[PDB]
């Protein structure tokens, strides 16, 4: 119906500094620094103090207003990513052919490389996104762990790794092999 | 009504304040299906226990600002879910009879009501040993 103003709030924690100019947001904390282009949405930022920045839409309809919270969130996860950080964990799941997973490189590149999936002679490769760093748990069998400042980049890189193992022409309720996201959370602050 | 029903809780509660002298507020946070309740008939020659929906429970309190203001000190312990033992004496023995029903791991008390006080409860008078040797202990320390 057009909402004359409508706004959301972004808590800035100690140690971080968010600066925004023509909707290009730069967020900096202990972990690092992320940036994101928000030009595709007409929203207006406003800094109340260094703990708190507001975002409004003026005279906006439903779909516009829906953009508001989502901007808040994206900017929230920038702040979390650069303080606590992001960590997604995965598990290899296979009934028979063990899924054999390593890091390999070409032109100093870095790929997650997957071998023997359902007994496949083919090799699967997934580029490791910049900023995201891969580990392998020491004390959980078949674990794989992606982490970094960017939920976006961690989460997509995990998605890439699971999508590459899909199982074609088999009943996928019986043939459940894959690499799946098993937990997702923060780098710092327990697990 | 449901504001009749809101009021209803208010109505009876006030009445129970005005029907007992002591009150034990026993915490009834968590804990649920069949057990304790059925012991309480047996223990209802001493008390009324009432379980109920919280915002409602709180607003009852608001309606009792009129008098008996000492129940205000119950207020910081309204939190979660608590339940009543409307009561006369013992608050440290009878109480323990009420408490005993079969533990879970203490079923389940975590707060006390003692007429403006909030004991363990376990100490209230047993020898007048805080009134003949501790109402004159700095009279003892200095005559």
């Amino acid at each position: 119906m057009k909402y004359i103003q409508t706004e959301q709030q972004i808590e800035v924690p100690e140690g971080v500094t968010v600066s925004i100019k023509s909707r290009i947001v730069k967020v900096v904390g202990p972990r690092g620094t992320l940036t994101k282009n928000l030009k595709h949405i007409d929203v207006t930022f406003t800094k109340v103090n260094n703990q708190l920045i507001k975002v409004a839409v003026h005279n906006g309809g439903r779909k516009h207003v829906a953009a508001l919270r989502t901007v808040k969130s994206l900017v929230d996860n920038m702040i979390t990513g650069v303080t606590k950080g992001y960590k997604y964990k995965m598990r290899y799941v296979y009934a028979h052919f063990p899924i054999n997973v390593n890091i390999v490189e070409k032109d100093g590149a870095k790929f997650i490389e997957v071998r023997n999936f359902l007994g496949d002679k083919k090799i699967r490769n997934v580029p490791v996104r910049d900023g995201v760093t891969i580990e392998f748990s020491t004390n959980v069998k078949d674990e794989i762990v992606l982490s970094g400042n960017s939920v976006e980049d961690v989460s997509q890189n995990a998605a890439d790794l699971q999508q590459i193992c899909r199982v074609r022409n088999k009943d996928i309720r019986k043939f459940l092999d894959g690499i799946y996201v098993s937990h997702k959370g923060f780098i710092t602050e327990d697990l | 009504g449901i504001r009749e029903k809101k009021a209803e809780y208010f109505a009876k509660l006030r009445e129970y304040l005005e029907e007992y002298k002591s009150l034990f507020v026993v915490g009834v946070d968590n804990v649920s299906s069949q057990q304790m309740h059925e012991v309480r008939k047996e223990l209802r020659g001493r008390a009324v226990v009432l379980m109920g929906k919280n915002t409602m429970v709180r607003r009852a309190i608001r309606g009792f600002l009129s008098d008996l203001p000492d129940f205000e000190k119950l207020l910081p312990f309204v939190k979660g879910n608590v339940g009543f033992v409307f009561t006369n004496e013992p608050l440290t023995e009878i109480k323990n009879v009420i408490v005993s029903n079969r533990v879970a791991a203490g079923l389940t008390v975590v707060q006390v009501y003692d007429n403006g006080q909030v004991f363990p409860s376990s100490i209230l008078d047993i020898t007048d040993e805080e009134l003949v040797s501790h109402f004159v202990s700095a009279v003892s320390t200095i005559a």
Binding site: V93, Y94, L176, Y180 | -
Partner: protein, 52 residues
Amino acid sequence: IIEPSLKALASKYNCDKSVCRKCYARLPPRATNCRKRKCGHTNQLRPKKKLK
């Protein structure tokens, strides 16, 4: 083979889903409407069927 808990893990992906009855989309298991425009966002959904 495959510990109960990983079979469960695999199932959040492979089988705990619902299905559009007009267009067949694999949909979230608690969904009310199909996300697809071709079937008119129908709310005619069914659970994906469980193995034997």
